[PDB]
Amino acid sequence: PSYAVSSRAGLIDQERRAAVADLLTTLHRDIAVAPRYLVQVIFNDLDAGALFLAGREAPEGHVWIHADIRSGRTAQQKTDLLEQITSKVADVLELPPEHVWVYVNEIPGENMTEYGKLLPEPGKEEEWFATLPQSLQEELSDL
Amino acid sequence: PSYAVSSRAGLIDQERRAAVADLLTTLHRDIAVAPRYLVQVIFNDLDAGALFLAGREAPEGHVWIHADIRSGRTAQQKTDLLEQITSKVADVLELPPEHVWVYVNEIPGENMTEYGKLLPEPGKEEEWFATLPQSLQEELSDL
Amino acid sequence: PSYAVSSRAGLIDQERRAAVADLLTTLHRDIAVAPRYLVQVIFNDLDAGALFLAGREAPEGHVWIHADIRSGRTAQQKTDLLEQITSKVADVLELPPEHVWVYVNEIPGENMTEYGKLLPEPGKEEEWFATLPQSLQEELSDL
């Protein structure tokens, strides 16, 4: 899972970036049943007049979250993850939920490498983990 | 729907960002049959030597548009949206259509949050609107 | 095919961008069997604290590659492309392969414009090429 977060440069502090990354990685560990070490968060900061809504320049307090996750998850965890991201990120950034927009694109696990290895089906992370080299096993377990 | 537009920084003025966003926003309202206030347009400006075509640096006058769209639309609707974006964005920017590249990615409606609420199937926008609180209804009608 | 390569600004030299770009378009030309002139490579450079892994700031030596490719390709082509991009880009950048993460998103050819014309399904590139005006043909042949 890689979350890309797009907002006007300056909207998200470095310490609020840290809080957003911690929250997304945490909600993802809990709603998806996936280990945190798989989670990547990227902040794409945007120029001043680079974001438009309804053909008109956006309010400064607008955030778009694009998430790439593995296909094969239940409908419930997907929608639950969406509602909770909209909810908790809006609170963390002190924004109205109407201005945290979240999209989930689903891609098969075999279409992803992370830590140098093709990723498995969701739910098969223990099996996948037992295939890694022992030194990779113990750096990941520290996270 | 979010159109992300990537081009070499400086190719698209702020005044042409306004024209492109309005053009994209209007085309989407007419070809897809969806309300204007659902449309987000983002401009990702690129570093000087950050764009390559066929393994070599691209000419400055090159634009790539990535659109995230809901699943469930007809083949003809998608093809008209693609062909018209290539043509009309090319004209607005005084470019050859050969250098406006457009990709359309399809995401289910329930994989999207906008205005704090999960999106419906394309074509069910009215019912969705009827679920919103009256005050949110009245700003969306403002757009 | 559009490869977007995201890394902390400064990790990839301009001269390292060219080598990565040339390598991606060459790998794509051999593993997918598609002409070089369709391949676009984009470098998205990130702020100092903009990349997080496992809820924490990433090491500098981390690269994420997002590819949009046409759907319809064999499992074998995809997995070979993924493993070879992860391995050889790691090598070109003098990075650990564990820190070149690759995602491939699949988009049907009819959902793509390049050089102003909708793309055909994979393998049908000769037919598509014979559709172009002679003058566009001889520019693509130069690439």
Coordinates of C-alpha atoms in Angstrom, one line a residue:
Chain A
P1 CA 0.0 0.0 0.0
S2 CA 1.2 3.5 -1.0
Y3 CA -0.8 6.5 0.0
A4 CA -0.1 9.6 -2.1
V5 CA -1.4 12.8 -0.4
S6 CA -1.9 15.9 -2.5
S7 CA -2.3 19.3 -0.9
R8 CA -1.1 22.9 -1.4
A9 CA 2.5 23.2 -0.4
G10 CA 2.4 24.5 3.1
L11 CA -0.9 23.1 4.2
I12 CA 0.7 20.1 5.9
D13 CA 3.5 20.9 8.4
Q14 CA 6.4 18.5 8.7
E15 CA 5.0 17.4 12.1
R16 CA 1.4 17.1 10.7
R17 CA 2.9 15.1 7.8
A18 CA 4.4 12.8 10.5
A19 CA 1.0 12.6 12.2
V20 CA -0.8 11.9 9.0
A21 CA 1.7 9.2 8.0
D22 CA 1.4 7.6 11.4
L23 CA -2.4 7.6 11.2
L24 CA -2.7 6.2 7.7
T25 CA -0.2 3.5 8.5
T26 CA -2.1 2.7 11.7
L27 CA -5.6 2.7 10.2
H28 CA -4.2 0.5 7.4
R29 CA -2.8 -2.0 10.0
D30 CA -6.1 -2.2 11.7
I31 CA -8.7 -2.1 8.9
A32 CA -6.7 -4.0 6.4
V33 CA -5.0 -6.8 8.2
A34 CA -1.6 -5.9 6.9
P35 CA 1.8 -5.2 8.6
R36 CA 2.9 -1.6 8.9
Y37 CA 6.2 -2.3 7.2
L38 CA 4.3 -2.5 3.9
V39 CA 2.9 1.0 4.1
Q40 CA 4.4 3.9 2.1
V41 CA 3.1 7.5 2.4
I42 CA 4.1 10.1 -0.1
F43 CA 3.3 13.9 0.1
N44 CA 2.9 15.6 -3.2
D45 CA 2.9 19.3 -2.5
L46 CA 1.2 21.6 -5.0
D47 CA 1.9 25.1 -6.2
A48 CA -0.4 28.0 -5.3
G49 CA -3.0 27.9 -8.1
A50 CA -2.6 24.3 -9.1
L51 CA -5.7 22.7 -7.6
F52 CA -9.2 23.2 -9.0
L53 CA -12.6 22.1 -7.9
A54 CA -15.7 22.4 -10.2
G55 CA -13.6 24.4 -12.6
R56 CA -12.7 27.0 -10.0
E57 CA -9.6 27.3 -7.8
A58 CA -9.8 25.2 -4.7
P59 CA -9.9 26.4 -1.1
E60 CA -6.5 26.2 0.5
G61 CA -7.8 23.6 3.0
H62 CA -8.3 20.8 0.4
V63 CA -6.5 17.4 0.5
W64 CA -6.7 14.5 -2.0
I65 CA -5.6 11.1 -0.9
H66 CA -4.8 8.4 -3.5
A67 CA -4.2 4.9 -2.2
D68 CA -2.9 1.9 -4.1
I69 CA -4.0 -1.3 -2.3
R70 CA -4.1 -4.9 -3.2
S71 CA -7.2 -6.4 -4.8
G72 CA -9.0 -9.2 -3.0
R73 CA -10.2 -7.4 0.1
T74 CA -13.8 -7.5 1.3
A75 CA -16.2 -4.7 0.4
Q76 CA -16.5 -3.9 4.1
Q77 CA -12.9 -3.3 4.9
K78 CA -12.5 -1.2 1.8
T79 CA -15.4 1.2 2.5
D80 CA -14.5 1.1 6.2
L81 CA -10.9 2.2 5.3
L82 CA -12.3 5.0 3.2
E83 CA -14.7 6.4 5.8
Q84 CA -12.1 6.2 8.5
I85 CA -9.4 8.0 6.3
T86 CA -11.8 10.8 5.5
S87 CA -12.8 11.0 9.2
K88 CA -9.5 10.8 11.0
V89 CA -7.4 12.8 8.5
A90 CA -9.9 15.6 8.6
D91 CA -9.6 15.7 12.4
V92 CA -5.8 15.4 12.4
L93 CA -5.5 18.3 9.9
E94 CA -8.4 20.3 11.5
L95 CA -10.3 20.2 8.2
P96 CA -13.9 19.5 7.4
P97 CA -14.4 15.9 6.1
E98 CA -15.9 17.5 3.0
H99 CA -12.4 18.5 2.0
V100 CA -10.5 15.3 2.5
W101 CA -11.1 13.3 -0.8
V102 CA -10.0 9.7 -0.9
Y103 CA -9.7 7.4 -3.9
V104 CA -8.8 3.7 -3.6
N105 CA -7.3 2.0 -6.7
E106 CA -6.9 -1.8 -6.3
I107 CA -4.1 -3.6 -7.9
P108 CA -3.2 -7.4 -7.7
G109 CA -0.4 -8.2 -5.3
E110 CA 1.6 -9.9 -8.1
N111 CA 1.7 -6.4 -9.7
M112 CA 3.7 -5.1 -6.8
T113 CA 7.3 -5.5 -5.5
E114 CA 8.1 -4.2 -2.0
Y115 CA 11.4 -5.1 -0.3
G116 CA 12.6 -6.7 -3.5
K117 CA 9.9 -9.4 -3.7
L118 CA 6.5 -9.7 -5.4
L119 CA 3.7 -9.2 -2.9
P120 CA 1.2 -11.9 -2.1
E121 CA -2.5 -12.0 -1.8
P122 CA -3.9 -10.1 1.2
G123 CA -4.1 -12.3 4.2
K124 CA -1.1 -14.4 3.1
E125 CA 1.6 -12.1 4.7
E126 CA 2.9 -14.7 7.1
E127 CA 3.5 -17.2 4.3
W128 CA 5.2 -14.4 2.3
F129 CA 7.3 -13.3 5.3
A130 CA 8.6 -16.9 5.8
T131 CA 10.1 -16.7 2.2
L132 CA 12.3 -13.6 2.9
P133 CA 16.0 -13.9 3.7
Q134 CA 16.5 -14.1 7.5
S135 CA 18.3 -10.7 7.6
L136 CA 15.3 -9.1 5.8
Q137 CA 13.0 -10.9 8.2
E138 CA 14.6 -9.3 11.3
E139 CA 14.8 -5.7 9.9
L140 CA 11.1 -5.9 9.0
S141 CA 10.1 -7.3 12.4
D142 CA 11.8 -4.4 14.1
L143 CA 9.2 -2.1 12.4
Chain B
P1 CA -13.2 12.5 -11.0
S2 CA -9.7 14.0 -10.7
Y3 CA -7.7 15.1 -13.7
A4 CA -4.0 15.2 -12.9
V5 CA -2.1 17.2 -15.5
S6 CA 1.7 16.9 -15.7
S7 CA 3.8 19.2 -17.9
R8 CA 7.2 20.9 -17.7
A9 CA 6.9 23.8 -15.3
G10 CA 6.2 27.1 -17.1
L11 CA 4.5 25.5 -20.1
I12 CA 1.0 26.1 -18.7
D13 CA 0.5 29.7 -17.3
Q14 CA -1.8 30.2 -14.3
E15 CA -4.2 31.7 -16.8
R16 CA -4.0 28.6 -18.9
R17 CA -4.3 26.4 -15.8
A18 CA -7.6 28.3 -15.4
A19 CA -8.6 27.6 -19.0
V20 CA -7.6 23.9 -19.0
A21 CA -9.4 23.3 -15.7
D22 CA -12.5 24.9 -17.0
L23 CA -12.3 23.0 -20.2
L24 CA -11.7 19.7 -18.5
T25 CA -14.5 20.4 -16.0
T26 CA -17.0 21.3 -18.8
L27 CA -16.1 18.4 -21.1
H28 CA -16.5 16.0 -18.1
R29 CA -19.9 17.5 -17.4
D30 CA -21.0 17.1 -21.0
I31 CA -19.5 13.7 -22.0
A32 CA -19.7 11.9 -18.7
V33 CA -23.1 12.9 -17.5
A34 CA -22.0 14.1 -14.0
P35 CA -22.3 17.3 -12.1
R36 CA -19.5 19.9 -12.3
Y37 CA -18.9 20.1 -8.6
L38 CA -17.5 16.5 -8.6
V39 CA -14.5 17.5 -10.8
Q40 CA -11.0 18.0 -9.3
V41 CA -8.2 19.1 -11.5
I42 CA -4.5 19.1 -10.3
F43 CA -1.5 20.5 -12.1
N44 CA 1.8 18.7 -11.3
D45 CA 4.6 20.8 -12.7
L46 CA 7.8 19.0 -13.6
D47 CA 11.5 19.7 -13.2
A48 CA 13.4 20.8 -16.3
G49 CA 14.8 17.5 -17.5
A50 CA 12.2 15.3 -15.8
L51 CA 10.2 14.2 -18.9
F52 CA 11.4 11.5 -21.3
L53 CA 9.7 10.1 -24.4
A54 CA 11.2 7.0 -26.2
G55 CA 14.2 7.1 -23.8
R56 CA 15.1 10.7 -24.7
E57 CA 14.2 14.0 -23.2
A58 CA 10.7 15.2 -24.3
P59 CA 10.1 18.5 -26.2
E60 CA 8.9 21.2 -23.8
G61 CA 5.5 21.2 -25.5
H62 CA 4.3 17.9 -24.0
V63 CA 1.5 17.3 -21.6
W64 CA 0.2 14.1 -19.9
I65 CA -3.3 13.9 -18.4
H66 CA -4.2 11.2 -16.0
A67 CA -7.9 10.9 -15.2
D68 CA -9.4 8.8 -12.4
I69 CA -13.0 8.0 -13.5
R70 CA -15.8 5.9 -12.0
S71 CA -16.5 2.5 -13.5
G72 CA -19.8 1.8 -15.2
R73 CA -19.7 4.1 -18.3
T74 CA -20.2 3.1 -21.9
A75 CA -17.4 2.5 -24.3
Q76 CA -18.6 5.4 -26.4
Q77 CA -18.7 7.8 -23.5
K78 CA -15.1 7.0 -22.6
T79 CA -13.9 7.3 -26.2
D80 CA -15.5 10.7 -26.7
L81 CA -14.1 11.9 -23.4
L82 CA -10.6 10.8 -24.5
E83 CA -10.7 12.0 -28.1
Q84 CA -12.2 15.4 -27.0
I85 CA -9.6 15.9 -24.2
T86 CA -6.8 15.2 -26.7
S87 CA -8.2 17.7 -29.2
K88 CA -9.6 20.5 -27.1
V89 CA -6.7 20.6 -24.6
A90 CA -4.3 20.6 -27.6
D91 CA -6.1 23.7 -29.0
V92 CA -6.3 25.6 -25.7
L93 CA -2.6 25.2 -25.1
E94 CA -1.6 25.8 -28.8
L95 CA 0.0 22.3 -29.0
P96 CA -0.1 19.5 -31.5
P97 CA -2.6 16.8 -30.4
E98 CA 0.2 14.3 -30.7
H99 CA 1.7 15.9 -27.5
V100 CA -1.4 15.8 -25.3
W101 CA -1.4 12.2 -23.9
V102 CA -4.5 11.1 -22.0
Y103 CA -5.0 8.0 -19.8
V104 CA -8.3 7.1 -18.1
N105 CA -8.3 4.9 -15.0
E106 CA -11.6 3.4 -13.8
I107 CA -12.4 3.1 -10.1
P108 CA -15.8 1.9 -8.6
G109 CA -17.9 4.7 -7.1
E110 CA -17.8 3.2 -3.6
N111 CA -14.0 3.3 -3.9
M112 CA -14.3 7.1 -3.8
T113 CA -15.0 9.7 -1.2
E114 CA -15.9 13.3 -2.2
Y115 CA -17.5 15.9 0.1
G116 CA -17.3 13.5 2.9
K117 CA -19.5 10.9 1.3
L118 CA -18.9 7.7 -0.8
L119 CA -19.8 8.2 -4.4
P120 CA -22.6 6.4 -6.2
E121 CA -22.7 4.5 -9.5
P122 CA -22.5 6.8 -12.5
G123 CA -26.0 7.9 -13.3
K124 CA -27.2 7.8 -9.7
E125 CA -25.9 11.2 -8.8
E126 CA -29.4 12.6 -8.1
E127 CA -30.2 10.0 -5.3
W128 CA -26.7 10.7 -3.9
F129 CA -27.5 14.4 -3.8
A130 CA -30.8 13.6 -2.0
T131 CA -28.8 12.0 0.9
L132 CA -26.7 15.1 1.6
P133 CA -27.5 17.6 4.4
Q134 CA -29.4 20.6 3.2
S135 CA -26.5 23.0 3.7
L136 CA -24.1 20.9 1.7
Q137 CA -26.8 20.6 -1.0
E138 CA -26.9 24.4 -1.2
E139 CA -23.2 24.9 -1.8
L140 CA -23.1 22.1 -4.4
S141 CA -25.9 23.9 -6.2
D142 CA -23.8 27.0 -6.0
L143 CA -21.3 25.2 -8.3
Chain C
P1 CA 3.2 3.0 -20.9
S2 CA 4.0 5.8 -18.5
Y3 CA 6.6 5.2 -15.7
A4 CA 6.4 7.7 -12.9
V5 CA 9.5 7.5 -10.7
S6 CA 9.2 9.2 -7.3
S7 CA 12.2 9.8 -5.1
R8 CA 13.6 12.4 -2.7
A9 CA 14.9 15.3 -4.8
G10 CA 18.6 14.9 -5.5
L11 CA 18.8 11.1 -5.2
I12 CA 18.6 10.7 -9.0
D13 CA 21.1 13.0 -10.8
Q14 CA 20.0 14.4 -14.2
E15 CA 22.6 11.9 -15.6
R16 CA 21.0 9.2 -13.5
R17 CA 17.6 10.2 -14.8
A18 CA 18.7 9.6 -18.3
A19 CA 20.2 6.2 -17.5
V20 CA 17.0 5.1 -15.7
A21 CA 14.8 6.5 -18.4
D22 CA 16.8 4.7 -21.1
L23 CA 16.8 1.5 -19.1
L24 CA 13.0 1.6 -18.5
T25 CA 12.2 2.2 -22.1
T26 CA 14.6 -0.6 -23.1
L27 CA 13.2 -3.1 -20.6
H28 CA 9.7 -2.2 -21.7
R29 CA 10.7 -2.7 -25.3
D30 CA 12.0 -6.2 -24.7
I31 CA 9.7 -7.6 -22.0
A32 CA 6.5 -6.0 -23.2
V33 CA 6.8 -6.2 -26.9
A34 CA 6.0 -2.6 -27.7
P35 CA 7.9 0.1 -29.6
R36 CA 10.0 2.5 -27.6
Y37 CA 8.2 5.6 -28.9
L38 CA 5.2 4.7 -26.7
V39 CA 7.2 4.9 -23.5
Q40 CA 7.0 8.0 -21.3
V41 CA 9.1 8.3 -18.1
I42 CA 8.3 11.0 -15.4
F43 CA 10.5 11.9 -12.4
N44 CA 8.4 13.2 -9.4
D45 CA 10.9 14.7 -7.0
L46 CA 9.9 14.9 -3.3
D47 CA 10.7 17.2 -0.4
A48 CA 13.1 16.3 2.4
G49 CA 10.4 14.9 4.7
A50 CA 7.8 13.8 2.2
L51 CA 8.4 10.1 2.0
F52 CA 7.4 7.7 4.9
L53 CA 7.8 4.0 5.2
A54 CA 6.1 1.9 8.0
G55 CA 4.8 5.2 9.5
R56 CA 8.3 6.6 9.8
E57 CA 10.5 8.8 7.5
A58 CA 12.1 6.7 4.7
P59 CA 15.8 6.4 4.2
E60 CA 17.0 8.7 1.4
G61 CA 17.8 5.7 -0.8
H62 CA 14.3 4.8 -1.7
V63 CA 12.5 4.9 -5.1
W64 CA 8.9 4.2 -6.0
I65 CA 8.0 3.4 -9.6
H66 CA 4.4 3.6 -10.8
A67 CA 3.7 2.2 -14.2
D68 CA 0.5 2.5 -16.3
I69 CA 0.6 -0.3 -18.9
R70 CA -2.1 -1.7 -21.2
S71 CA -4.1 -4.6 -19.9
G72 CA -4.1 -7.8 -21.9
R73 CA -0.5 -8.9 -21.2
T74 CA 0.5 -12.4 -19.9
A75 CA 1.3 -13.0 -16.3
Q76 CA 4.9 -14.0 -17.3
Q77 CA 5.5 -10.6 -19.0
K78 CA 4.3 -8.6 -16.0
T79 CA 6.2 -10.5 -13.4
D80 CA 9.3 -10.5 -15.5
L81 CA 9.0 -6.7 -16.0
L82 CA 8.4 -6.2 -12.3
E83 CA 11.4 -8.2 -11.1
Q84 CA 13.7 -6.8 -13.8
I85 CA 12.7 -3.1 -13.1
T86 CA 13.3 -3.7 -9.4
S87 CA 16.6 -5.4 -9.9
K88 CA 18.2 -3.3 -12.7
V89 CA 17.0 0.1 -11.5
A90 CA 18.4 -0.7 -8.1
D91 CA 21.7 -1.6 -9.8
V92 CA 21.8 1.6 -11.9
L93 CA 21.1 3.7 -8.9
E94 CA 23.4 1.8 -6.5
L95 CA 20.5 1.1 -4.2
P96 CA 19.3 -2.0 -2.4
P97 CA 16.6 -3.8 -4.5
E98 CA 14.5 -3.8 -1.3
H99 CA 14.3 0.0 -1.8
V100 CA 13.1 0.1 -5.4
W101 CA 9.3 -0.6 -5.1
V102 CA 7.4 -1.1 -8.3
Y103 CA 3.6 -1.0 -9.0
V104 CA 2.1 -1.7 -12.4
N105 CA -1.4 -0.5 -13.0
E106 CA -3.2 -1.9 -16.0
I107 CA -5.3 0.3 -18.3
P108 CA -7.0 -1.0 -21.5
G109 CA -5.5 0.4 -24.7
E110 CA -8.8 2.1 -25.7
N111 CA -8.4 4.1 -22.5
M112 CA -5.2 5.7 -23.8
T113 CA -4.3 8.4 -26.2
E114 CA -0.7 8.7 -27.5
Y115 CA 0.4 10.8 -30.5
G116 CA -3.3 11.8 -30.7
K117 CA -4.7 8.4 -31.4
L118 CA -6.3 5.7 -29.2
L119 CA -4.0 2.9 -28.5
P120 CA -4.7 -0.7 -29.7
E121 CA -4.6 -3.7 -27.5
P122 CA -1.1 -5.1 -26.9
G123 CA 0.4 -6.9 -29.9
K124 CA -1.7 -5.0 -32.5
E125 CA 0.8 -2.2 -32.9
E126 CA 1.6 -2.8 -36.5
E127 CA -2.1 -2.3 -37.4
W128 CA -2.2 0.9 -35.4
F129 CA 1.0 2.2 -37.0
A130 CA -0.5 1.6 -40.5
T131 CA -3.4 4.0 -39.4
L132 CA -1.1 7.0 -38.9
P133 CA -0.5 9.7 -41.4
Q134 CA 2.8 9.1 -43.3
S135 CA 4.4 12.1 -41.6
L136 CA 3.7 10.9 -38.1
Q137 CA 4.9 7.5 -39.2
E138 CA 8.3 8.8 -40.2
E139 CA 8.8 10.7 -36.9
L140 CA 8.0 7.5 -34.9
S141 CA 10.3 5.5 -37.1
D142 CA 13.1 8.0 -36.1
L143 CA 12.5 6.9 -32.5

